């Protein structure tokens, strides 16, 4: 018996507001799908200019649900934002 793990999506965008707007937008999209989001953590600045990364916690996926979800997420991606999918520690 196995189920989809809890995978954090790190929304990395140079502009904080753009990431926040997508973070609010993507989370609201998750509300449509009823996807549980435990937390939205903020990473420190990517000091070298700096960039801002925002975690969108995602818990619980299904085989058919997962395939549609990623497709919706891609289309939602407004501009110059890089998506990421990584298993939580």
């Amino acid at each position: 018996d196995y189920e989809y793990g809890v995978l954090n999506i790190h929304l990395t965008a140079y502009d904080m507001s753009l990431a926040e707007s997508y973070a609010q937008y993507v989370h609201r999209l998750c509300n449509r799908l009823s996807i549980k989001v435990e937390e939205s953590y903020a990473m420190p600045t990517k000091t070298m200019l700096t960039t801002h990364e925002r975690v969108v916690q995602i818990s619980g996926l299904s085989a058919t649900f997962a395939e549609i979800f990623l497709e919706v997420l891609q289309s939602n991606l407004p501009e110059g934002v890089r998506l990421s999918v990584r298993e939580h520690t």
């Binding site: 196995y2 989809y4 793990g5 502009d15 904080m16 507001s17 753009l18 707007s21 600045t45 700096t50 996926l61 299904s62 085989a63 058919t64 997962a66 395939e67 549609i68 990623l70 497709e71 891609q74 289309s75 939602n76 991606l77 407004p78 501009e79 999918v85």
Partner: protein
């Protein structure tokens, strides 16, 4: 009983839907205020322009999703099928699913099997046989040998009905987009 396994491969849409011009100009406006209120060779956009007929090539479409569809030959049958391979009960569906990824396609496609539960099963009889349709999501696909001797076609659902007539093969749309 003869056991035959198949995989319903899913190709992600690489390119997002284009934003409206008002969104772009609105994006410019929010971009400017964001700085004020800030708190602390690439591949071609569409690689289909040159081909126009390479259904075999994985990159038949980039804006939309695709599903691999491979002509298959059996001992007594030769019909257009979803990617299919012969499997044994000892191997689990994911293990059989993995074999389909390399056996039929022999490519370095990037696939992860997160859900072991299958999405499609249909029985075809003339000898009792059944087809297993697995489900998986692709982050990206690197399909080697685009021009194979096989008639593999990447089409999500548009060509599924055209090539797969019977309900045992035309109902694959039920779990597809």
């Amino acid at each position: 009983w003869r056991l035959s396994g198949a995989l319903c491969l899913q190709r992600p849409p690489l390119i997002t839907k284009a934003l409206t011009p008002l969104q772009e100009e609105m994006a410019g406006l929010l971009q400017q205020i964001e700085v004020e209120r800030s708190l602390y060779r690439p591949g071609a956009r569409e690689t289909e322009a040159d081909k126009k007929n390479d259904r075999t090539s994985l990159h038949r479409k980039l804006d939309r999703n695709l599903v691999l569809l491979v002509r298959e030959k059996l001992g007594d049958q030769d019909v257009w099928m979803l990617p299919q391979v012969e499997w044994q009960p000892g191997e689990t569906l994911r293990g059989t699913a993995e074999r389909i990824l390399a056996t039929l396609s022999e490519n370095n496609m990037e696939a992860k099997f997160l859900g072991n539960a299958p999405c499609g099963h249909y029985k075809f009889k003339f000898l009792g046989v059944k087809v297993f349709f697995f489900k998986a999501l692709l982050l990206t696909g690197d399909f080697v040998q685009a021009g194979k001797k096989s008639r593999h076609v990447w089409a999500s659902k548009e060509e599924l009905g055209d090539y797969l007539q019977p309900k045992y093969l035309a109902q694959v749309r039920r779990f597809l987009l």
